[PDB]
């Protein structure tokens, strides 16, 4: 289609390809919504290939793509207003990733990132996250926003809020964490879990549609791995790292106490301890303002200084009047 | 332990004036300024632009350089000490003008527009701002001593005088008093222009110093001395 | 001794008047000025705001007349905004009046050199770095950079070395002219400084640091 | 809270004073107690508001700009809260769509071979199709 | 421990008729700054609004300010009295001609 309608072939082909750029994006999202567990390999050979074509189209038709991207953000938001998590699908998760591919995430302002990144944050907080499906959906969402701030490293409080409840959800309460609001208490992981077998931490998108203990553990590990990275990249720099990591440290401590074999929280806890040791928590000093100079005013002056008409008229009368009296005399 | 000030917002320091004598400040007197007008329009007489007319007027064109006065004002006004509101400038012209230079003034940097201003200051005897809120340049009554603060130290620039460190000098002087430095803007002449007012004369460098260089050396030392930074 | 670019061993305070707005215009060839030639620069299309070679003049006066030069511990380089590097012999006594100073620059730019009967002013080949001493510290003047002490900075700095200060002769512009050559950016005072004031500030410190007096 | 002047480093501060400032920094501990229920005994005045400083790095630019105000002088007498109280996620999104200033979209020069990880360059490691 | 003044705190600055008025200045001479509002007109407004002139501008309550605004925007409705609310060049040419003839006679 792109070859048959190149810009040079005929007038208006740019517009047709520009509209096709929007059409292609919906096709990429549409296919992901369709079931593909039967032929995952074939779906993988088309899903990535279409994205590559969309990348070429976006290079020339970013404006058309941006308009369609904003429409999807508005449409999904409206669907979230009425269906909540039921509106959310795999295609949404696919949809957000493509913006990261096709747009600059590391901007203070962007047309598509900022509406979307507002919209991930709403999901990370508003959604109940009371099912393994819903927790797995959030785990993907946390990874997307983390990749959005891969260079910017801006602070997202929803990520902190998301991690606290999910970690506490799998330990349900211990009666020590009453400040964390849980939405499900029946997802508590059993004590018999081994935590020494090598379980894949990668969460396939198709497995979500299917959604036990192994699946619960795998979702926990992926979320917890994202936690360790976020401490390393974003929170380490923030001045309030000790305050931000304090609730997380307590939750991770419960994981180690209940599960001694379970190693990663000890690695995170040991890692968290190292950062708090090196970081010097000194009172902030922000009201130092540079002393302000005395004012400066330009001088007022004429460039060529000289050492209305009625006044000029009056001036002439005096001279003529002076002459005449000396004439009469 | 001490309570913080109610407002931490930075406020511009008060603009020093001759009326106030209590506050400590660096007074710089640009003595022997060659600043004179004459009709051709009135134009500031210059050593080079106007030679024949000054010959007709009978004065030496060697001492007909308002450029030197201009450069001294530029470095003086642009010095950080002025930005801190701790320096005020006076100019003693060769015929006998005493000119008060408001620290807030921003003279034109190009000499032609500087000369354009000066003829006006001499004729109107004062200069107003563009917004017409303060008088920046004003001619004032001699002697300079009455304008000078009540408790003050007076010195001049003498090449023959002993070489002194300006920073060490100011530190040894008292905190309530103020320092007056009489700088001779003249290109060449005997250093007795301000002898009647001053009581001592000091040297800064064993090598000769230009008026613009010397006054800048003064203010820089005080800013080190007073931590004006 | 009169310091020269050929000699690199001696400690000296180098200062670079970067982005110098010295330009000659033939209707006769005269130095372009912000006030003297406004419409003419408009025809050339260059902004008249960045057309003040007076800045370069004033810096040289306070710089060349500073005691440090009289002690033979100073050499000056000028980088024209056009891309011309000029070597200023420390022995030169440039005219105090600007209109005369303009007459020298047009002679310099077109003759590429000024000789007196050693060339007092010489146009030299870029880059600036090759002319500089082999072991030398490079800094600029930045309003945003932390405020430091010229006296303390020079004192803690080594002795076999030499110090470069790239002073911006522009009225206004971004402080990235010498980013490529320089390794760090420093502020001299919290308050704003003119180019003439700042180099006067810096040279005064070297006189205090090296006891030139 | 927003600034303790005792821990400012002044360039005129003498080397012995510099040493004293270093010791003060080392020995500081935040005295604010979170579990104390009596607000007059929490020792809040002796602490600092590091949390507000972090909000200056908040992902929302406007929220960051609002948080930045503590770094600026307190010229304004007060802020009208009724312009700030009833904001929701929907309002923020609606405001973003209805923006006075429109900007040109920018693109990413860095290229990723695959968007998702397998089960060359992967944009989103740890997730698979 | 809990005290709340019903009148409210003093207002250092206020916005009336799209004009910023200092609370420190009094109602009459703070309102004078408004364009078209002079000393006598402001005094008449303050009398009609039943606001004590000896008060400062900051002291004015919400109802008093709204009434004053109504006084400004509706003067007639509150019975504010109505009373309260080339040839030269030719002459120059003639004089010039007279001057030329005076020269001619002389």
């Amino acid at each position: 289609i792109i070859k048959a309608y190149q810009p040079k072939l005929a007038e208006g082909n740019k517009e047709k390809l520009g509209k096709f750029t929007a059409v292609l994006l919906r096709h990429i999202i549409f296919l992901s919504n369709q079931n593909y567990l039967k032929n995952v390999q074939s779906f993988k050979r088309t899903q990535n290939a279409l994205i590559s074509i969309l990348k070429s189209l976006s290079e020339k038709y970013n404006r058309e793509l941006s308009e369609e991207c904003r429409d999807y953000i508005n449409e999904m938001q409206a669907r979230y207003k009425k269906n909540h998590f039921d509106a959310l699908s795999n295609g949404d998760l696919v949809f957000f990733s493509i913006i990261g591919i096709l747009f600059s995430t590391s901007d203070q302002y962007h047309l598509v990132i900022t509406p979307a990144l507002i919209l991930m944050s709403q999901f990370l907080e508003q959604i109940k996250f009371n099912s393994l499906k819903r927790i797995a959906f959030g785990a993907v969402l946390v990874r997307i926003v983390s990749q959005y701030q891969r260079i910017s490293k801006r602070y997202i409080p929803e990520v902190v809020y998301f991690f606290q409840k999910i970690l506490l959800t799998f330990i349900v309460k211990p009666l020590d964490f009453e400040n964390i609001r849980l939405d499900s208490y029946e997802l508590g992981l059993p004590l018999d879990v081994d935590f020494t077998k090598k379980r894949s931490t990668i969460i396939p998108l198709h497995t979500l549609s299917t959604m036990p203990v192994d699946q619960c553990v795998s979702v926990l590990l992926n979320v917890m791995e994202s936690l360790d990275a976020t401490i390393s990249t974003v929170w380490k720099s923030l001045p309030a790292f000790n305050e931000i990591i304090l609730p997380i440290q307590q939750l991770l401590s419960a994981y180690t106490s209940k599960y001694s074999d379970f190693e990663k929280p000890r690695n995170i806890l040991n890692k968290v301890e190292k950062l708090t040791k090196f970081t010097e928590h000194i009172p902030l000093a922000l009201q130092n303002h540079k002393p302000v100079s005395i004012p400066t005013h330009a001088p007022k002056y004429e460039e060529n200084f000289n050492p209305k008409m009625k006044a000029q008229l009056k001036k002439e009368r005096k001279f003529t009047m002076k002459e005449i009296r000396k004439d009469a005399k | 332990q001490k309570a913080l000030p109610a407002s931490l917002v930075p406020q511009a320091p008060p603009v020093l004036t001759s009326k106030d004598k209590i506050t400590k400040r660096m007074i710089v007197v640009l003595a022997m300024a060659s600043l004179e007008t004459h009709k051709i329009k009135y134009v500031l007489l210059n050593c080079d632009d106007h030679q024949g007319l000054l010959k007709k007027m009978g004065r030496d064109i060697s001492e007909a350089r308002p450029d030197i006065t201009h450069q001294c004002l530029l470095t003086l006004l642009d010095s950080p000490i002025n930005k801190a509101g701790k320096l005020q400038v006076y100019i003693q012209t060769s015929r006998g003008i005493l000119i008060e230079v408001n620290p807030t003034v921003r003279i034109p940097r190009t000499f032609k527009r500087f000369s354009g201003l000066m003829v006006q200051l001499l004729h109107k005897l004062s200069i107003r701002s563009v917004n017409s809120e303060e008088k920046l340049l004003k001619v004032i009554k001699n002697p300079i001593t009455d304008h000078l603060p009540t408790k003050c130290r007076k010195v001049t620039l003498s090449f023959d005088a002993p070489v002194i460190r300006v920073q060490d000098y100011i530190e040894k002087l008292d905190d309530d008093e103020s320092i007056c430095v009489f700088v001779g803007a003249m290109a060449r002449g005997k250093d007795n222009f301000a002898d009647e007012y001053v009581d001592e004369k000091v040297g800064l460098s064993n090598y000769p110093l230009s008026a613009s260089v010397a006054c800048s050396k003064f203010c820089h030392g005080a800013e080190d001395a007073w931590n004006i930074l | 001794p009169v310091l020269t670019s050929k000699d690199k061993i001696t400690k000296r305070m180098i200062v670079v008047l970067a982005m110098a707005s010295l330009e000659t215009h033939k209707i006769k060839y005269v130095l372009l000025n912000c006030d003297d030639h406004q419409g003419l620069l408009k025809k050339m299309g260059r902004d008249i705001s960045e057309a003040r070679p007076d800045i370069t003049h004033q810096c040289l006066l306070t710089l060349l007349d500073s005691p440090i030069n009289k002690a033979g511990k100073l050499q000056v380089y000028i980088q024209t905004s056009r891309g011309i590097l000029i070597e200023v012999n420390p022995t030169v006594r440039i005219p105090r009046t600007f209109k005369r100073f303009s007459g020298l620059m047009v002679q310099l730019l077109h003759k590429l050199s000024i000789r007196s009967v050693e060339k007092l002013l010489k146009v030299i080949k870029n880059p600036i770095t090759d002319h500089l001493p082999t072991k030398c510290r490079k800094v600029t003047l930045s309003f945003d950079a932390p405020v430091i002490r010229v006296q303390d900075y020079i004192e803690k700095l080594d002795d076999d070395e030499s110090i470069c200060v790239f002073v911006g002769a522009m009225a206004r512009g971004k402080d990235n002219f010498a980013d490529e050559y320089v390794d760090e950016k420093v502020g001299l005072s919290n308050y704003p400084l003119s180019a003439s004031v700042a180099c006067s500030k810096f040279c005064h410190g070297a006189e205090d640091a090296w006891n030139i007096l | 809270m927003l600034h303790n002047p005792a821990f400012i480093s002044n360039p005129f501060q003498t080397p012995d004073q510099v040493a004293n400032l270093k010791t003060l920094k080392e020995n500081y501990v935040d005295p604010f107690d979170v579990h104390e229920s009596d607000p007059e005994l929490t020792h809040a005045l002796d602490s600092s508001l590091w949390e507000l400083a972090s909000l200056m790095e908040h992902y929302h630019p406007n929220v960051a700009t609002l948080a930045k105000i503590f770094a600026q002088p307190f010229k304004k007498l007060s802020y009208n809260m009724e312009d700030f109280l009833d904001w929701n996620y929907d309002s923020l999104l609606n405001a973003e769509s209805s923006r006075k200033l429109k900007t040109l979209p920018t693109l990413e020069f860095e290229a990723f071979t695959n968007v998702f990880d397998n089960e060359g360059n992967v944009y989103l490691p740890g997730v698979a199709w | 421990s809990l005290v709340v003044q019903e009148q409210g705190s003093f207002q250092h600055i206020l916005r009336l008729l799209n004009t910023n008025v200092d609370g420190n200045i009094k109602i009459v001479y703070a309102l004078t700054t408004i364009k078209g509002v002079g000393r006598r007109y402001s005094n008449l407004v303050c009398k009609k609004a039943d606001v004590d002139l000896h008060k400062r501008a900051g002291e004015l309550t919400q109802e008093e300010l709204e009434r004053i605004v109504q006084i400004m925007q509706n003067p007639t409705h509150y019975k504010i009295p109505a009373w309260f609310l080339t040839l030269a060049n030719n002459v120059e040419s003639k004089l010039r001609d007279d001057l030329e003839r005076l020269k001619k006679i002389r």
Binding site: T296 | T110 | - | - | R15
Partner: peptide, 25 residues
């Protein structure tokens, strides 16, 4: 309640540098 106090707060609500030359004319 917002509308009521939205009304009340309405009344409540209300350099040459470095080397810059004075404006030419």
């Amino acid at each position: 309640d917002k509308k009521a106090r939205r009304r009340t707060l309405r009344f409540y609500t209300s350099r040459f540098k470095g080397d810059d030359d004075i404006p030419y004319k």
